[PDB]
Design a protein around this nucleic acid. Structure first.
Ligand SMILES: CN[C@@H]1[C@@H](O)[C@@H](O[C@@H]2[C@@H](O)[C@H](O[C@H]3O[C@H]([C@@H](C)O)[C@@H](O)[C@H](O)[C@H]3N)[C@@H](N)C[C@H]2N)OC[C@]1(C)O
Ligand SMILES: CN[C@@H]1[C@@H](O)[C@@H](O[C@@H]2[C@@H](O)[C@H](O[C@H]3O[C@H]([C@@H](C)O)[C@@H](O)[C@H](O)[C@H]3N)[C@@H](N)C[C@H]2N)OC[C@]1(C)O
Ligand SMILES: [Zn+2]
Lengths: 71, 50, 119, 86
RNA sequence: AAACUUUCAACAACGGAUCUCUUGGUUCUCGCAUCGAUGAAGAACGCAGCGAAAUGCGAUACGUAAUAUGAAUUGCAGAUAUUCGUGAAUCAUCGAAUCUUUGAACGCACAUUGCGCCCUCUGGUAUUCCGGAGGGCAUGCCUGUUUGAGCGUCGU
RNA sequence: AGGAAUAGUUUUCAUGCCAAGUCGUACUCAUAACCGCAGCAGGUCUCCAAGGUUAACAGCCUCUAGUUGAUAGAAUAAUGUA
RNA sequence: UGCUGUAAAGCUGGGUCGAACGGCCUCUAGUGCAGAUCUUGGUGGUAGUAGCAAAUAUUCAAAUGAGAACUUUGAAGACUGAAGUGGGGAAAGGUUCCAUGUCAACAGCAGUUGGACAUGGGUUAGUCGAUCCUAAGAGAUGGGGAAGCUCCGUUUCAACGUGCUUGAUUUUUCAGGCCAACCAUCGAAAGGGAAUCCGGUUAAAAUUCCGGAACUUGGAUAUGGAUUCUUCACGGCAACGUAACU
RNA sequence: GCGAGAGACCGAUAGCGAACAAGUACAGUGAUGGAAAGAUGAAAAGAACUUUGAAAAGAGAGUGAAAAAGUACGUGAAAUUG
RNA sequence: UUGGGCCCGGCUCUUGUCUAUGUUCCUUGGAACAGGACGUCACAGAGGGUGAGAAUCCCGUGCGAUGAGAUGACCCGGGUCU
């Protein structure tokens, strides 16, 4: 996941299994003040949902990840 | 199969979660009787019957 | 320990909602720190703080509606008394105590007397 | 060829999971559960099968509501809240 | 004569009898009457700082409030947790709540996490297109309201 | 039905603007991942298909790719099996 | 170790052991085993025996390791021989995938290896499917049977539209008009069906990611063009042509 | 069903199938079928340390009233075996 | 012969608080809850716990005492106004 952060400007999140791509886009906007170029989703083999969120070119995913606090 | 329903995949996820050995700190508790997980399952021996 | 319920009931609906936002932000922060410590008993406290604030908001609004429907003939079903299905079908005290005028006259005319023997 | 060779051709499920009871007794073509009788309004049961009644009956589940009726009856089906003492 | 075999004894095995027990069963008696559309019983899937079960619970998830009580919990760890006290622990008590997806199971459908429609609010330059939040739309029958149909029928 | 005189089209002509939800997606598919109680010589639907010989997609040899798995060692009576 | 009794049995010495138990007078019973191809559990002889022989076939050296016929690398000898022992899928399985560690049990020899065991990682779509359509068929509904669970009917003896279009009016009300033969619903991962390709990238995903280049549907809406004073375009004998062209 | 009190009852092959994570594990397409399994010690004091071994383990040592109690754990019969 | 509206009690139910007398000496034992001696309480010598058979160590048992609440046309005992 952090390789995708470093390269593709993509943030990787676990999300609620019931949420769709529109809700995830709005949620990252409201929580982190970033704009998603897209949201790719995935239900994992353990039953939880993973979202691959690529930010627009106006944002640097590494800076946002440092600010969120997990890098 | 690769093509599978949401219901099936949800059952398969729960089946993976229950197929783990005992957390070993359980055995240290006051008056503990469980020595191992007696409800293990191997994919080739016992089938899930979904 | 966390937030104290007797302190929460003094607050207004605006002060409760802003506190709920900050507890959720704090729980999100702890889950990020959960990825690399990775043991955070603090999370249990904040989870239960969110439960208490959510409880106090709900019981505040529930008492507003009870005051809104107080004395009304029809009130929402979740404010009506819930005893059991069969007990709610039972005749009310007024209905059960109804008497025909024929029966009332005879009851007044011949009440059970009070009496003893040996004198 | 009716034994081992014929046993090799078993890959079409007759039953799948039942929504009501969850057993894998929902017959695919009849759209009926052989265990609980879903989607009939009544649950399937027979007096010639008492052990089947034991397996799935009141008290084998959570009883999330009946659990507390006897305590609620014991207090006369109270309404209101408790009062602090002097 | 050894080896070998057979019998006994000792010790060691194999195995789990015997003896002692028992938060279980079984029978009898005494007392009580309380499930559900105000959504039951049952099902599925989740929830803990570290858990697979069992037990508890429902996105407020091994629980929230309240009442009582009065110093723990404990396998380890740990308060921005606590002790002459609005105070540790407590399914002690329990009258306030929460109560996912379902289920008689109720918008339609269901081997699908498929598809409508109505109202209020809200985002994208929007009564129509696309998105989000909240609230709604089953059947049989009763009483009533309203809007109607029939040269069935009265009067003018 | 609606449309001109200094005015409506028409997005079935060109260019430009916005958006596209949900679930599945790993891996095996078989002389060991399926069913035959098992890593069983059984059973289980289908697509792709090189050179030589030849009537031939048969048999026999070969290239790409893939395997070299199946308890092993020493001897070679009788009776077997092939 | 002995003693008593014809006997059923009773008592005692020594060892082991750790929490209750016996004589006598009576009461009571789920009260005495060698057998029932008895029941459950346990254990022998057989016996280190039958056997571990289909699918051409293995060998040298090094590395690793306590340990190598069986692991890895190199050399070689072979085979499948494209109707494969190759490369993919459907059904079914469900993490077996991948990396790291790892050998008690399992892999009917072995094991440093493994589909085993342990800890983690891993499945990204407007364009691929499902989803939608109907097929044989299944099946609600006014209803007609049946004591009833329910059976029958679906072109179903029925007052069966959650209708649609405009002129707009805001007043969220109207004004009309047009029809209602048919249409609950379910039924295909091989039938029908809107639209994506190439190159690159991982330990393990890719027509899904990255780079570049497109396409479809739904919507909005501006410019340019085209059309109209012969109002709703011209040309070609024609077949027909065109950027448009109520 | 809810709350109680009892017995000339059974005592882990008995007593309910279940005294235990029992309607569990497991089987069957399905209706259904359905086990086994209680006891170290008062207290884990669950054997530090040395030594042989690749290791599992052994030998010393140690704890305990007892190791003739070592999580293969109360006693520990018979068949069978050294 | 007389209806009705209410207050307090009783009864009924639920529930809080409170309670006698050895841990004296000797022996055995790892442990005294065993045996011996001397006692105590007893309307309490039921039962359980605690390092072995515990009335007297703990919880209870027996006996009472004293409070809080709820409910009752359809239970009754007195009072209040029409
Ligand atoms: C005397 N009573 C009769 C009553 O029996 C009934 O008649 C039915 C008639 O309606 C039916 O006929 C009807 O229904 C059939 C349907 C069954 O397929 C239709 O095909 C037909 O078009 C329709 N008219 C006829 N086939 C039988 C009569 N007994 O209805 C008509 C009536 C006069 O009331
Ligand atoms: C660790 N293995 C477990 C083990 O706990 C086992 O326990 C037995 C235990 O039941 C025996 O203990 C037994 O004690 C008596 C008597 C016969 O001894 C029995 O009546 C009783 O059923 C049983 N508790 C004990 N002596 C040996 C352990 N292996 O129980 C099953 C098992 C899987 O073998
Ligand atoms: Zn069912």
């Amino acid at each position: 996941a952090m390789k995708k952060v470093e390269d593709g400007n993509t943030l990787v999140f676990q999300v609620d299994i019931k949420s769709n791509k529109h809700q995830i886009k709005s949620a990252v906007k409201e929580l982190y003040d970033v704009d998603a170029l897209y949201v790719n989703t995935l239900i994992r083999p353990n039953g939880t949902k993973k979202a691959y969120i690529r930010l627009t070119s106006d944002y640097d995913a590494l800076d946002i990840a440092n600010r969120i606090g997990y890098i | 199969p690769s093509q599978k329903s949401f219901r099936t995949k949800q059952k398969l996820a729960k089946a993976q979660k229950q197929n783990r050995p005992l957390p070993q700190w359980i055995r240290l508790r006051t008056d503990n009787k469980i020595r191992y997980n007696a409800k293990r399952r191997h994919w080739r021996r016992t089938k899930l019957g979904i | 320990a966390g937030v104290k319920t007797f302190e929460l009931r003094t607050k207004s609906k605006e002060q409760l909602e802003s506190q709920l936002v900050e507890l959720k932000q704090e729980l999100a922060t702890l889950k990020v720190q959960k990825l690399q410590r990775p043991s955070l008993p603090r999370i249990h406290t904040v989870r239960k703080n969110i439960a208490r604030v959510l409880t106090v908001i709900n019981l505040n609004q529930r008492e507003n509606v009870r005051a809104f429907y107080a004395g009304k003939k029809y009130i929402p079903k979740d404010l009506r008394a819930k005893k059991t299905r069969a007990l709610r079908r039972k005749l009310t005290k007024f209905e059960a105590s109804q008497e025909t005028e024929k029966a009332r006259k005879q009851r007044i005319a011949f009440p059970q007397r009070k009496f003893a023997i040996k004198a | 060829g009716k034994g081992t060779p014929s046993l090799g051709k078993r890959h079409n499920k007759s039953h799948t999971l039942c929504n009501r009871c969850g057993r894998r007794s929902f017959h695919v073509q009849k759209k009926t559960c052989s265990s609980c009788g879903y989607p009939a309004a009544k649950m399937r049961s027979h007096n010639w099968a008492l052990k089947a009644k034991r397996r799935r009956t009141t008290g084998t589940g959570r009883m999330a509501y009946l659990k507390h009726v006897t305590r609620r009856f014991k207090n006369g089906f109270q309404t209101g809240v408790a009062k602090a003492q002097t």
